[PDB]
């Protein structure tokens, strides 16, 4: 005597368990391939890019094409012990992703050019 | 204003402060009031006339 108020039968909601696999299904976890040496390929040194460094506190980077801005930002930060105001990406007709990276005002591009070797 | 904009606006821009405020138009509320008597009262008048018909019968 648990009466039926509704005139449908809806399936009873059963218990359903969580995977307790007897092995892992692949041995090891895949080594991460988008790194803080791989996501950035090279800084550009084009005249319209030197002009962009000196005048706008930016750096012009070619970047690995699967990169996001929060990846390009935690890359450029990690490496040229820098910090980044904002990233701003395009895809060159060629498939190379550019990303020109504004560096916070406390902090200069024209110095960090000579550190990374460009100029 | 275009409806998604209503999410920005304050409560008071979207109603007027009443019964059925901001959905219904005064003129229909104040009939809904004085309809809601006379429906109610004349169930009472039928209630007593029924009671008197069964008191007679």
């Amino acid at each position: 005597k648990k009466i039926r108020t509704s005139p449908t039968f809806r399936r009873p909601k059963t218990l359903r368990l969580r995977r307790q696999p007897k092995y892992p299904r692949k041995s090891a976890p895949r080594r991460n391939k988008l790194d803080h040496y791989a996501i950035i390929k090279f800084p550009l040194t084009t005249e319209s890019a030197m002009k962009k460094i000196e005048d706008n506190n930016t750096l012009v980077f070619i970047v690995d094409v699967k990169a996001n801005k929060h990846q390009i930002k935690q890359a450029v930060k990690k490496l040229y012990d820098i910090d980044v105001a904002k990233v701003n990406t395009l895809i060159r007709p060629d498939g190379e992703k550019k990303a020109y990276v504004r560096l916070a005002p406390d902090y200069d591009a024209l110095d960090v050019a000579n550190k990374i070797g460009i100029i | 204003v275009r409806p998604k904009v209503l999410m920005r606006l304050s409560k008071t821009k979207k109603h007027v402060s009443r019964a059925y405020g901001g959905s219904m138009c005064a003129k229909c509320v104040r009939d809904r009031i004085k309809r809601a008597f006379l429906i109610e009262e004349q169930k009472i008048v039928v209630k007593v006339l029924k009671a008197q018909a069964q008191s007679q019968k």
Partner: protein, 238 residues
């Protein structure tokens, strides 16, 4: 007055169109899924149709008073469980190489379970009683058995529940069962059942063999057909 004036009544009325209707049980006004609907109207057909004798006999069965003696009787007598089996062997392995053992003992009398086991030892007249489950799924497997049993003059019987018959022998289900021998002391109770059973079965056959058992309509139809015989009685009985 220990009765606050406010708690009133507000008694509702669920006439058509008056106050909104409440929640009754609807078990007949509900959508019975395709297994249920189906199994429901197997049981109906299986009464509605004209069922054959041989399949009917698998309705009429034992009663509490008889059944419970049977299943008492068997409980002295269930075939060795596993574990219980192991120590029948293990004890003879230690008793053989210690304090003598020819090792035939005396195999104590027990049940006999399956059909093509039973039917052989019914066809051999090696059975005092045979218990048959009624609800067996392909009925094929036990249609004959009663006929066979009465020809050999072997007391057969039809107990309810292939489960509770298949719980004696330690399984899910079982269709038949049999006592070939009994312990001497336990033979008064066996011969008590046997005589009680075969008044009721083996010596009935021309009552069972010619009894069709369905052809029963639905009570909704029956209530209507009978309500026309109060019209036809009360036309020219008045």
């Amino acid at each position: 007055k220990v009765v606050n004036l406010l708690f009133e009544k507000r008694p509702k009325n669920f006439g058509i169109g008056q106050d909104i209707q409440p929640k009754r049980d609807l078990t007949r006004f509900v959508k019975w899924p395709r297994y249920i609907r189906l199994q429901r109207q197997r049981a109906i057909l299986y009464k509605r149709l004209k069922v054959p004798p041989t399949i009917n006999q698998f309705t009429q069965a034992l009663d509490r008073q008889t059944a419970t003696q049977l299943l008492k009787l068997t409980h002295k007598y269930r075939p060795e469980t596993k574990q219980e089996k192991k120590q029948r062997l293990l004890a003879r392995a230690e008793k053989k190489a210690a304090g003598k053992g020819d090792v035939p003992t005396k195999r104590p009398p027990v049940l006999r379970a399956g059909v093509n086991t039973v039917t052989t030892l019914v066809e051999n007249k090696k059975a005092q009683l045979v218990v048959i489950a009624h609800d067996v799924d392909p009925i094929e497997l036990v249609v004959f058995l009663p006929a066979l049993c009465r020809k050999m003059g072997v007391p057969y019987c039809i107990i309810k529940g292939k489960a509770r018959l298949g719980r004696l022998v330690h399984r899910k289900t079982c269709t038949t069962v049999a006592f070939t021998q009994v312990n001497s002391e336990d033979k008064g109770a066996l011969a008590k059942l046997v005589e009680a059973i075969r008044t009721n079965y083996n010596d009935r056959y021309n009552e069972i063999r010619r009894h069709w058992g369905g052809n029963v309509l639905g009570p909704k139809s029956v209530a209507r057909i009978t309500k026309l015989e109060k019209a036809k009685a009360k036309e020219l009985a008045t």
